[PDB]
């Protein structure tokens, strides 16, 4: 009776008759890499998301960079990324010698402010990367036209909001090309790595394919230099039968959301009151007493963790960005603890924290 | 047709105990640096004979990750044979290292170590070995001047798993060891998967980190990392493989024997082991390449080339087109590889020397 903060079995065991039967197909086939499956998924994950073309690669990680890669920047090449994202989205940008140009969000978003973006445009900006954090779908409109001023470049980094929707169109289908995280965690979560590219671009789609695999677009030939980047058949079978729920999937932990919005009341506890589409991947509280609630919530048995306590100018590894002021960014990180909640979360486990945070007199 | 590889062949055997594995990942509901990549990784160092065995995304990733390790300055040298698969010059290039290409030695297809020392320049920081086809390079030498030069030896081991020098496994004969485990690989999983293997704690530990993110500790990033691990899935698959590999090993072994008993065709030169050799590829040698080729596939044989053009060669390194290395180009011209797997039937053996025998030009 300790209830874990995302329990994958739950999650996955409504599928474990499908997930074996594919895979058994699988092993019929004797072929485990860019087979029918990759192909299969591609073209459901394409249709799901609006683009014309989606390309699987081994995790969200390599999604970023790829594309990034793809641009084929000057060393030095500025993009512009919110500040608070996690760390991989800025890995994406350094592994390419990009210098990320980091913006603070907004205090009632989490996500990239884009009246601060602008000011920060430079003749070195070639690009914006989005992140639609937590679940929620950034506000595009100001940043596309943005990005059409200046002929800039929008990533999407989409490893936390499948299938959320702006306006008329799906995250992934917001810019110019979009990365997707499958890990294990994620709304359509694989098991094991993997994840996405989803472009509209003919060109892009062709060259990413390459730069996925070694550079070679024909046997034998090597037109880039490029890396090994692929979503395995049977990764690929796992997510094809879980992206048929993946709507359904979502409504449901925003039932779960508002449940929380609407019966969680505590002084000492902001909600992620939402100012978008969200589909919850993360369902994020604020609070000045932060690892005191942790430890409450522990010892009452339920397990949370934290997105994020430390942003990435603070790393170790980034120890040339640690002295930028950016104090929203901080006190986010500060604040910040994230509640359990899933597709399948039983109604006595969200009922019990929602009394239990309602009960915490800090 | 006979195929190349038949991997449903190869893999049938182990079925069962696939499914068995799953099912058990399955009810453990983790799927990533769990248990199974534990145990792989430590069945995997017991088998080359080293301390640490870092499972990681497949062999490019493990290659690249060591190079990352090592944290060599931009355009810092890496001496590597010129006829190795692409991938290993990938790994020197996506670090920004410059690759030194060296000649083989024709009676190895390995890098010949005489040619070595003669490109040795303030730059160089490592020698990267590839134990081509599945034999051994002869590290006598390579070790001297490692040692003379201060030099880090880099073992690609994606072809050659097993394979033994002196004392010592593939794996164990340099710094740090790279292997894919692609599964056309001697030990092949079902996905994509790689390992590092080395002895040093310290390194190993940063190999750890570096392929997960550059995290040591949950929310921490020491390093400026990667994502590149090897799922539980696969380890586990590959640890139910492992304890056959000798054995898959020999099986090989005995194949190639009867193609070397067996295939006597003027037109043919024949591979040789010098050192010790676990037939990944069956690698012949025809100034009629394309033409047997094509013979074979009439003959409803599958045959794939490793490889027909050489790094140097190619689009992607334009400014190393004009790099004068004939012994590698001549390779890459003539080079052919025969079915060769650990499951192979004696009849289809058996076929591939006769109609080889029978390829009269
Ligand atoms: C904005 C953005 N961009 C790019 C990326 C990069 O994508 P990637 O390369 O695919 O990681 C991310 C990744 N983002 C996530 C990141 O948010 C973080 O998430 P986390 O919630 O801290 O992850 P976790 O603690 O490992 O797993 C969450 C829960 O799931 C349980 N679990 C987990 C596993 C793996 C399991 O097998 N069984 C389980 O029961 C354990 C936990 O309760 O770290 C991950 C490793 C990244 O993939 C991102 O947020
Ligand atoms: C020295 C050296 N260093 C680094 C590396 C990099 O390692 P990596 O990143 O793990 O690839 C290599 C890779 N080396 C190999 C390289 O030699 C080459 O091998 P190849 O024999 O041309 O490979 P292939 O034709 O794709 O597969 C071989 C046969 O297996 C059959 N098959 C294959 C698959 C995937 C299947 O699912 N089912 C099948 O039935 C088809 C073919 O008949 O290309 C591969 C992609 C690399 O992993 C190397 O040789
Ligand atoms: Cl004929
Ligand atoms: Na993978």
Redesign the interface.
Same mark, same amino acid.
Do not use: H, M, V
């Given at each position: 009776g300790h209830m874990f903060f995302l329990?994958?079995?739950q999650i /996955? %065991?409504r599928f474990?008759t499908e997930?074996?039967t594919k895979?058994?197909e @699988?092993?019929?086939?004797?072929?485990? @890499?860019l087979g029918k499956q990759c192909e299969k998924f591609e073209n459901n994950f394409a249709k799901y998301c609006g683009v014309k073309h989606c390309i699987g690669v081994? /995790?969200?990680?390599?999604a970023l960079r790829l594309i990034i890669k793809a641009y084929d920047f000057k060393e030095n090449d500025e993009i512009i990324v919110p500040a608070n994202t996690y760390?991989?989205s800025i890995?994406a940008i $350094? %592994?390419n010698k990009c210098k990320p140009i980091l913006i603070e969000p907004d205090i009632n978003t989490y996500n990239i402010n884009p009246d601060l973006i602008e000011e920060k445009i430079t003749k070195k900006t070639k690009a914006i990367m989005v992140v639609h954090l937590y679940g929620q779908v950034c506000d595009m409109e100001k940043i596309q036209l943005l990005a059409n001023k200046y002929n800039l470049k929008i990533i999407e980094d989409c490893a936390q909001a499948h299938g959320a929707i702006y306006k008329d169109k799906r995250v992934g289908n917001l810019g110019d090309a979009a990365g997707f995280s499958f890990?294990?965690g994620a709304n359509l979560g694989?098991?094991? %790595?993997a994840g996405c590219i989803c472009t509209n671009d003919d060109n892009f789609a062709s060259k990413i394919r390459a730069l996925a695999n070694?550079?070679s677009h024909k046997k034998?030939?090597?037109?880039? $230099?490029?890396?090994?980047s692929?979503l395995?058949?049977?990764?690929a079978a796992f997510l094809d039968i879980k992206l048929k729920y993946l709507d359904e999937d979502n409504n449901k932990r925003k039932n779960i959301a508002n449940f929380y919005l609407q019966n969680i009341k505590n002084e000492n506890i902001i909600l992620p009151s939402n100012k978008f589409d969200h589909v919850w991947h993360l369902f994020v509280v604020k609070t000045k007493l932060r690892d005191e609630l942790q430890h409450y919530l522990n010892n009452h048995d339920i397990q949370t963790i @934290?997105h994020?306590?430390?942003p990435?100018h603070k790393?170790?590894?980034?120890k040339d960005l640690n002295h930028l002021k950016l104090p929203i960014t901080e006190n986010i990180h500060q604040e910040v603890l994230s509640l359990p909640i899933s597709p399948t979360m039983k109604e006595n486990d969200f009922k019990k924290v929602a009394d239990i945070l309602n009960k915490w007199k800090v």
């Open positions: 329990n994958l079995k /996955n %065991d474990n997930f074996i895979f058994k @699988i092993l019929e086939s004797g072929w485990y @890499i081994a /995790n969200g990680l390599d760390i991989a890995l $350094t %592994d890990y294990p694989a098991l094991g %790595d070694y550079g034998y030939e090597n037109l880039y $230099t490029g890396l090994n692929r395995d058949e049977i990764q @934290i994020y306590p430390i990435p790393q170790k590894c980034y």
